[PDB]
Amino acid sequence: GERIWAWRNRSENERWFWEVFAWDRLIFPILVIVAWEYLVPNHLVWAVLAP
Amino acid sequence: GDRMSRRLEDINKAERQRVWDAMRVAAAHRYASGQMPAWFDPEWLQQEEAPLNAMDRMRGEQRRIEEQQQWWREDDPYWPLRDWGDHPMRWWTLAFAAIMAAGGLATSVATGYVEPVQAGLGAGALLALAGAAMSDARCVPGALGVKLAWAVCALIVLKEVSVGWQHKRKRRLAASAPRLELTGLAAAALCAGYMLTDMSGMGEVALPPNPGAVFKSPDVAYRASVWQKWGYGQVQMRV
Amino acid sequence: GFLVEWSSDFITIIPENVDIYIWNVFSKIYRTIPLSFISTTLGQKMVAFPILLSLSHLLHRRILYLFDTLFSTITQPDTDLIARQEKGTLFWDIWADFLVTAADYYNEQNSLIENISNDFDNLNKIKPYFEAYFSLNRWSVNQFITYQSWHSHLFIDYHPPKTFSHIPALKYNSILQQPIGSLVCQIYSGLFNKQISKNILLVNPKTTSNNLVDYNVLLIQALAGETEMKIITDNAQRYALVNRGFAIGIKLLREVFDAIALNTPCIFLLEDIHAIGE
Amino acid sequence: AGFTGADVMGLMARAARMAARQGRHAITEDDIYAAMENKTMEATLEASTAGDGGGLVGGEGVEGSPDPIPPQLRRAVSVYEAGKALLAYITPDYEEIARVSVCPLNVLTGFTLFVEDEDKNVNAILTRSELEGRMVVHLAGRCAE
Amino acid sequence: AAVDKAKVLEDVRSIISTQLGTELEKVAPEAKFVDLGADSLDTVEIMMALEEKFEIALEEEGAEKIATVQDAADMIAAQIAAKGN
Amino acid sequence: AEGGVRMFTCSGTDFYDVYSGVGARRVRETFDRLRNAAPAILFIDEFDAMGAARGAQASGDESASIINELLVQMDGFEDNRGIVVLGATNRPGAID
Amino acid sequence: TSAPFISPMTPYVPEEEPTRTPPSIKDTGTLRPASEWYPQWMQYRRREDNYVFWQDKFMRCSTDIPWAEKRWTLFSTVWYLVQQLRFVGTPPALRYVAFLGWRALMFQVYAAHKALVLWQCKLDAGLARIGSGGATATFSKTMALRRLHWRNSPLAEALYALNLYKTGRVHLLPPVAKPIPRPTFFWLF
Amino acid sequence: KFRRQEFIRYRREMLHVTPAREVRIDTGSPDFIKWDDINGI
Amino acid sequence: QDITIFGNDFLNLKTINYLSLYNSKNKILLQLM
Amino acid sequence: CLPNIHTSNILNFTKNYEIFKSAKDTSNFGKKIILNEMQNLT
Amino acid sequence: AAVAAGWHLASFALNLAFWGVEGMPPDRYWPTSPRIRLQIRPGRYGNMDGGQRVYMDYLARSEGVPLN
């Protein structure tokens, strides 16, 4: 318990990163845009305008 | 008590020193642009300590010393382990830069490949500049020097153990694979010796703080600043 | 019968201990995914260890969030409640306000009749984002909650934003190190959900200075913030109500006590006990 | 003397705490005596120190309480408690001494714990010799100081 | 701060006895270390055993000037004295 | 006016009527109207009419209910972005 | 004297904030583990003087953390994954077994180190004889203790061996090793 | 859990608008009450 | 005759009690000065 | 117990100082390069 | 088949070695009640006065009290 207390006091930034930032604001939007552009034929109405 | 007096005195000394340092910095930025009242003697920015703290230390020191009197060098063998003002790993940096440049030239003339001499001379030049800035370990260049030196030796180790050397290509495919040879081992010894001595400088450069570090901070303006930066300026601060 | 439920919204009839049971079972089932993933994949060959660690953590959190979204989707209001909402909002807060203005401009069933008569006698969601140019899950930054739970049909506070750096005076008071330290050591190890409850007296000297500060509340909220627990606070003067020689509140207090006994683990504050202890 | 069941169970709890404070797990009898002394001194300093007043604790760091309790103020407390215990020993048919101590709870007073028999004067009798002996023992501390 | 020199002295005597093989009532509070069946490379082993028993670190200069079990006990008591501060 | 915001107002009387259970729905509805009409500032005169201390002429189910629902709207699930409750009183010791 | 205003006889060496948390209060400078709940010295002080145990706990865990242990870097956000695995993804029972095994191993390592230190003192006492040539078969308890607590850098012991082998002077010792600061680079580590 | 059960019981009973909390005398426990364990009696 | 210090000159009640009960005459004379 | 800190003076300054220092890292060792640029013939 | 079953059995044994929450500290990004974490609170409509009655026995249905 003491070790977990000391470790929680020194890693607040990393904790918030892995719980709130890693997927929702870093990996998911990258994946979503690349996935959409892999499908969706090479027009302009589909590749730029509707995105 | 006698135990809270010490706390008070350490707080006071630390605060006096911080204010004198802020003064040196702001006076330098005001004198390098003209607006200084012309009684200002620009040699004051060299007094490192503080006038008050210095007078206290001098008085205490003279009182202590007054009340207590109520190769090889056979007169001091431990001459290296003495503070001369420069980084310990300083002659190693220059030695390694010389070795790198010499090996680069030798091997790249004795073979005809253009890569080893370019790598060796670049490494030598950067390590020589680093070993120059490491000659005053108290200042800020004395810290950026160790930074540059560690970076260069690390890049050397990386290239060696992951891509290998162009002039060491052969016909087989398991023999021309990158292993760790002498120069990589020396560069690794250098990085380790740098890290085990002092690389603790310039410690205020890191990734910025999250809204996760200011959750329990005791200050509202700072936390609002951090939230605003990271994109949460509208969230309500029921705090 | 059937209609009292069939015509009412879902969450008001179901208790919360049921969903807490569901969540506990889910958590206990899937809490070993990272270790199994890591061991399976792992037997410049081990430069991938950071990647597998990242993948383990991300996958575990994905499973948890998928539970969360499946839960939060099936408890939205259905057709009946949405219809009730929008047609009630058209029936109550646009027609009846015009009705009030008409009434207090013109000014018991007979009265409502001349009212209904004398007033019969006289009477692209996306576009703004471009129009602004050619001419947020607060739970992600704020995890502090005020609530009333286990009985909805008690004003608990979840995760206050304090810590022991809001009370530097604790650092020197040599008589507060052992009890508070033991408390924290217990809570962090999990051994606090199986200790016998306790009573503690917090004496603070009489303070009538110009300050609105009080270090009892400060110390205990700092303890509730350091551990990220929940805290329940109430005053004793609110229970010294007597009439006819009958003290009503003094059993209200045992009622709130045996309610505290249902929301473990928790800290219960009770200030100014001399009001019921002279 | 005068304890009951609730008293002894609370005593065992406070004794375990007092045994922790000296870096041990097993409760000794010295921890029980220390628990008695601790309860007594805490009771007296809660009655003296109140809304303000105070001036009796000695380890709080505030302007009232010096931090290490200077040595000339420890010599005095030891002389005081030594004189009191010495006079309580050489007095015929006084109570018996169980534990002499100095600076309990950091307050600037001693504390002598007396074992007495409830069956020589059954909570009711006071003879003249006993009262005069008590007077002498209570002046001994000041006189030795 | 306030240290009980009695307990420290008792346990130092016990450790010395158990280390050399001499019975406890023979090691006097002023008995030096060579007369009790120990050389120079054995006054360091009992120093190590003392540190191991009390779990403290001995200052080195003060350990160069240890000659009587009394001074050993006094060094150890001074170490334990200044622990929290 | 100078803040440029819509003004809603009330009184201490219409809410402290003794028709039981009505206060809770009243405060709920007026606060939801504020929220959907925010920003806005609710001015309420003689606040001490409702915000009386405990042990008053009630059985802890009418007055306590309305001021507790005032609380729940002020603190519980705070989304009052731009809302301000500006009470008017001259007996500031009597407030709970 | 670069200092214009004040220059005491001792030159001013700047002080900087520490970079790592001190050893706890309980651990020895050596390799052997600690008593694992209560130190042995706690028994020889007054009950009212052992608040320093829990105070040192409060300090290392919550109150004085040096702002160099809260740096967010690319290395710390992966060490977070490692530590969170160890603390949340493993059951406490396996952790306990690993703890016992590690304690046993460290005890054996300490015994080995102590034997090696004793052998080193013999060898140095033997070499100082050749060095000074004459009578001194002695060593210094100072150097034995400094070796057992890891207070010498390798250069220091080399210089000391040379000084012994050439001039004896078994009481002339290297100054001391200074504490290693915490390495930092940039957003990197 | 016992507190929760009894609270549910009593609140449903009083919203629908006994103190016989007998205890069974175990004898196998080491704290078993002996007939003449008592003193000064 | 370490660090230059400046007092805060305020006498509480607890401080008056400490000085009255435990200090000599010269400490009192210094406070009065 | 509690030491009644608001009627003190050393507790006041030490308290406010420690709170301020713990709020945020406000050390700046990298602003002293301006001290190594005071004599330049450019 | 034995190996492909022993994998699942090892994972199940590992999950058994946990046995509870002893050793698990609190966490603020993950409360124990999904309603707090998900910000779920009833509104105005769908509120039956005698629905609370039903509420009780549902609790009494799961708090296992065979009275009901």
TrEMBL record, chain E:
Phosphoserine: residues carrying this PTM: 40
Chain ranges of the Carrier domain: 6-80
Molecular-function annotations in GO: acyl carrier activity
UniProt KW keywords: Fatty acid biosynthesis, Fatty acid metabolism, Lipid biosynthesis, Lipid metabolism, Phosphopantetheine, Phosphoprotein
Entry similarity comment: Belongs to the acyl carrier protein (ACP) family.
Protein role: Carrier of the growing fatty acid chain in fatty acid biosynthesis.
Name of the molecule in the record: Acyl carrier protein
Species in which this protein is naturally found: Chlamydomonas reinhardtii (Chlamydomonas smithii)
Residues of the full protein shown: 33 to 117 of 117
TrEMBL record, chain G:
Source organism superkingdom: Eukaryota
Name assigned to this protein: Uncharacterized protein
Segment of the intact protein contained: 67 to 255 of 255
TrEMBL record, chain I:
Signal peptide: none
Highest taxon of the lineage: Eukaryota
Name of the protein in question: Cell division protein
Native organism taxonomy: Eukaryota, Viridiplantae, Chlorophyta, core chlorophytes, Chlorophyceae
Gene: ORF2971
From TrEMBL, chain K:
Protein's name in the database: Uncharacterized protein
Organism of provenance: Chlamydomonas reinhardtii (Chlamydomonas smithii)
Parent sequence residues shown: 70 to 137 of 137
